[PDB]
Ligand binder design. Sequence first.
Ligand SMILES: CCCCCCCCCCCCCCCCCC(=O)O[C@@H](COC(=O)CCCCCCCCCCCCCCC)COP(=O)(O)OCC[N+](C)(C)C
Ligand SMILES: CCCCCCCCCCCCCCCCCCCC(=O)O[C@H](COC(=O)CCCCCCCCCCCCCC)COP(=O)(O)OCCN
Lengths: 108, 443, 152, 144, 546
Amino acid sequence: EAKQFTPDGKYMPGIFSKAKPLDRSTQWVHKNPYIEAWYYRRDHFENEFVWNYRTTIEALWFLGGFTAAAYALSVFAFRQADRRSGYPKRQILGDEPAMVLPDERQFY
Amino acid sequence: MFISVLLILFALCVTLIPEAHYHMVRVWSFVATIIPMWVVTWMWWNFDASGHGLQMLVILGRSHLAFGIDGVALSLMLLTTVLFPICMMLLRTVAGFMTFILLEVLVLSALCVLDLLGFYILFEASLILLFLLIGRAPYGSLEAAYKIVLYTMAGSLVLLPTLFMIYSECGTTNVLYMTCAYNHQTVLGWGLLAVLAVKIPLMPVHLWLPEAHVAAPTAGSVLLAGVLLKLGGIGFLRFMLPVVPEFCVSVFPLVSTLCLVSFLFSTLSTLRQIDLKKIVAYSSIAHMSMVTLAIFSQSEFSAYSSSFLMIAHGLISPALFLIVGILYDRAHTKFILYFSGLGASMPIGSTLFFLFTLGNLAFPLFPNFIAEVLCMVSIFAVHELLAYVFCVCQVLGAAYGFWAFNRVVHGLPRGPADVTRTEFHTVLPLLIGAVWLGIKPMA
Amino acid sequence: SVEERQSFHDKVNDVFKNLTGEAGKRWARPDEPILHTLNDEKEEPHIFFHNTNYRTSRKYINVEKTKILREQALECVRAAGTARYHKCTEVMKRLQAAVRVASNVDRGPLARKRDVGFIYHNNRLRELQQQAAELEIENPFPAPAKQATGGY
Amino acid sequence: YPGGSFWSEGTQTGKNGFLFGEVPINGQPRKTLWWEPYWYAGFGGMGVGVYLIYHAKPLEALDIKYWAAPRAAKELETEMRMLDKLNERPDLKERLVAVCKDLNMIEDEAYDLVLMRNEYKVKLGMHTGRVPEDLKAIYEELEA
Amino acid sequence: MFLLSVFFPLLGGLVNTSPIARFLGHRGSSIIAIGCMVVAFISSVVIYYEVVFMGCAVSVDVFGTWFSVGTFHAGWTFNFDLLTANMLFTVTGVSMAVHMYACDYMRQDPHLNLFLGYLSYFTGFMCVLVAADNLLVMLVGWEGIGVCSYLLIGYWSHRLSAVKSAQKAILVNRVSDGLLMWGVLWVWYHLGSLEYDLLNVYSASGFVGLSILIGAMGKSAQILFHVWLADAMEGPTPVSALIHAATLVTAGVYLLVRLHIHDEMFVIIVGSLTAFMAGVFGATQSDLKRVIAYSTCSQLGYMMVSLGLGETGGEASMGHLMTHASFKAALFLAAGMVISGNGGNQHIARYGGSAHSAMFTMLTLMVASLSLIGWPELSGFYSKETILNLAAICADPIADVAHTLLLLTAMLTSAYTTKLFYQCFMVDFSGSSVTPVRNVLPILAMAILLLDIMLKVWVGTNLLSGMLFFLPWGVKTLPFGLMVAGILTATAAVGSERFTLIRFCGSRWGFDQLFARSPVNPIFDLGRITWAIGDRGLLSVGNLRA
Ligand SMILES: CCCCCCCCCCCCCCCCCC(=O)O[C@@H](COC(=O)CCCCCCCCCCCCCCC)COP(=O)(O)OCC[N+](C)(C)C
Ligand SMILES: CCCCCCCCCCCCCCCCCCCC(=O)O[C@H](COC(=O)CCCCCCCCCCCCCC)COP(=O)(O)OCCN
């Protein structure tokens, strides 16, 4: 039953007062030890990485596999766009000297 | 320029105020960020939209540091000047006020510079400020600060010799003459890709963001999410596309696959997150991947749609960080398992959380909907499948967004009481900006 | 030669130095481009920025043309009612042609050419039907359409 | 229902909760927080300024689409009758299709070529000789 | 009067959810909601008579341009033509009676005005959906009814199954929303505009009709998308009536009827498979609301096949939509009254007799059930027989199988609807709570929908009613015999001993259980891979110990 304000405003800290003041930390949660441990473990989960069989296999087929699928799809989309725009074969990175950058003064 | 000197000198006078006058220190540091918002609004008034692409130019002799305004820089500058007083309302010490004042000077001057060496000098002069802001002693994380600083330094150090290579090649780092000279575009293109693929979180150089954007305080998170990621996008739009366009065509399959895998893998990771701030932090990577692919499409009105998505993200994600910051400030945790039934105990905060959840998922009447539609128009015009990949994966974003909202907002009511007047007014300018830019953005 | 290129550059620099314009005219909304036989127009920066401004003007004008024609076509179709199939094909054709010009001129380096009428597709179907007739095999493709949309 | 009917008085007086957790102390008016005058002045003067940008700037200065809307209309006026005359002249149409073939365009793109007489590539190609010399003549008798 | 049909339910929602409602309370908010729906219904009646009968469409530029970048131009514009007037009349008329019912049904709820405001918002976004003249304002309506469906399904938020049902509805519809967005991109790219009157397609690129069909299959709850519809019974009874009659499930059928750019093979196969599946699903349920939900899915299958048949089939599809809304809303309201009279029980094994309900609730269930099963010269008879006869003369060989599936479905529907009446009233009592409801507001809410059922017989939906498609007496009067067969079987209450078929059908073919592990658990596991093996593993860079 604390009194942190005078009748005309004027906040009082209540440093030496017996009654517990309501303040910023009044609704701070009571920590469950196992929840804190689980969140700490998930926060540092890079210490649990190991090159076993399952890790290697899933990192090959999903990470490298979908990265290669997306690169193949990007090249497919690039080539199809250049064909449907009247362009010849165009030079991507590592593709021998060819056409890059169509000229605006040219009709394709 | 004279105005900018006056604003800097007025802002720097916070240090000379004696600390025993608390009210004066608060009012001075808040007004020192209010004034540039008025000046940038006046710059928008002064802009001629039927005139030249570059307006209000100034060049400082033979010192590099040349400045000019286009549409992308002007919209981003307006967003930064909105965001900085909200950061001022979330700090309590003169050290915080001075760090954010120096950050505002550096961001505002970096957004409108026209010199590549000037961009290098102005941007990563903020590195030590970010290190001290993130690795603050009792409640920060030094590991996160080390990660963000070292990744940014690595990218910048790749760029710096290529910058100097084009400078020796043509004689200047001014972007107006760098775009008109013959330069070896592969080397400089790789340097520019190296900086801007770290600034924009693009996989694999993206691991600094989940640590830094969570370990930061609420003001630091608002700044880092809403502003500093977009310096990579304005780097693409101002420096890399005009100066090395042959590289920008030839790298398109690689940038395209980086954007696709960043979008998909970061969306898949966001679903398994158990920290609310880490949930908000991951979702920004997929949006920036859509921004980068829309910039690199160069197809219909690509600069317009990509800038509009940068503004929509910069409005919506700082508000989510603000709501998570309120929960953390008055409950001392960011863990999902400690929160339930927040609708019954914080009805106003939960309503704001729901509206900004819908905004982050690009629902209509929010600027993200218009942004994602126009970005996918720009992507579709190169090929239909590159648009289809983003279209079919919309269930994956909504899954994490609604799962986080439903876990923390409904259920048994436990948690802190509803928002104060100050918290509501930290949120409020972002909501008004969202309603305007999502209903009547243009005239 | 190098001397002729240098003298041309000096002339361009002198002209753009002593340039003025008033009475309701915006510079950087020029009436005409500067016609040149230069290999790589970016050799002369003033000409490059002038033609950049002219090209920006044309892109925005073509967008506006598309909007005016869309309003006209809406008026035709809504007045015609169920008679719209034989009454407003020509205005639909003109709107589709304007959209085609607005997209396909100064398109950028990566976007494919946009066909608003499915006109490239049906032209290709015609040529493939003719090639399969001389090849004397069955056509694996559809036969070309006479019109695909309300316009083309 | 209280009172025995739907149309009786209500049964609640006083605060139905406290907005922003603010409770009146001794009946006094609420004390203004330190940021409130400056917040309202700054963000209100930004909002009014953005409103005046949208509603009091000249239209050409606000958006380039207002500069180009009247210039597109007159060009469209002098292009609609060109397209009308092309539908009446088969010789002009076949000459236009020949120019379309020279410019890597198809027969359905004849309307497009009329609509791009002011483009940068067409003017520069008439100057350089990439564009056939007949296209200028076709434009001349289609405008006439 | 034209803008009063769209704005004004949105105004009622804005009033009842804002802090204005803190001054009105439950008692004042009920008055505000009912009046704000009466005005919109009156406006829609005027619009219906002007546009349907006198043929004068009206186009309104409401709020200028929304956004316009390049040639992508979206405007805040409405157009009120024949389909729009049909839909507005149906939506506002059903939503008025549902509001009048909900002001008494949810009387003992603690947050009544919030519920009424959500109902009004849901109605207003449906009106925005059907009143739009271009695709983007239609998408405003689409996602608005999606969001309001989420808010209303998971209204009782302290119950976890209701929250998970709302999340499931959002996610299942989000897949089809993505496909619909990609289809809008195709349409705009290859036609140049977004307005409906400029979208005349003779021959397009296949992805257009397929992706727009998938987007419509999401909202209209067709095969492989129906899974959210049954779980949406977690919400209160007015929510279910408004979801299954006028809002949400009729939006995809409206979109396909409006655009007419489909390919008929997919549409006919999806619709007939959906009709047969939902017919056998509803025959083996005991939850009173789930049977009606599956009958809704079955009738949406009928409308899908009809719009596959042709332009006349599209008109018949719109006609069946219009007549379906009235008796479906009446069925849900009568079922809610029966549930409240029996202490909240929803199992049809615990009903019986004529003591737990009013005379008017039993009459409402009887008349709406007779319209649903195609009893002659009632409302559903005309539309359902029109679709069946149009399917019997189609020259596509695929429509031969579809017609057989529809006739089997008709027999199943007359079986389980008669079972719903038989268990509820005819058998001996087997509950223990008798609290019959006889309030004025829900009875008048039911009487209005019965008046609309009479109106559809007296004044047809379109000109097809009375047109004779020339069929022999054997083909013509077979659905009447199938209705009688369903009635006789259900009143005989006979069952089969093939328990494995019974438990395969009653568990609804295991679609939810198979979906729980064919995409869902793999999505979770791929997230585990991308986080743990990629971000913490393969891409992680460690520290240098010194
Ligand atoms: C690349 C183009 C720039 C577009 C970026 C996207 C902007 C986001 C919002 C879209 C608003 C569209 C506004 C259109 C009219 C305004 C004036 C105008 O024309 O725009 C300016 C620039 O526009 C702006 O700066 C818009 C500012 C938008 C930023 C809004 C976010 C900040 C507000 C936060 C919330 C505040 C709430 C406070 C209230 C409590 C110039 O752009 P262009 O017309 O493309 O330039 C013409 C090119 N040329 C000269 C070469 C012919
Ligand atoms: C959290 C989500 C909440 C969802 C809220 C509901 C869903 C909303 C979805 C759509 C939102 C659109 C809102 C647009 C606001 C104004 C935009 C137009 C601004 C402007 O200056 O336009 C003029 C304003 O007119 C007018 O505004 C009319 C003049 C005043 C007469 C009518 C007064 C309005 C009564 C509305 C009742 C309640 C309706 C609730 C929606 C109209 O002229 P123009 O320049 O466009 O010219 C063209 C035709 N002349």
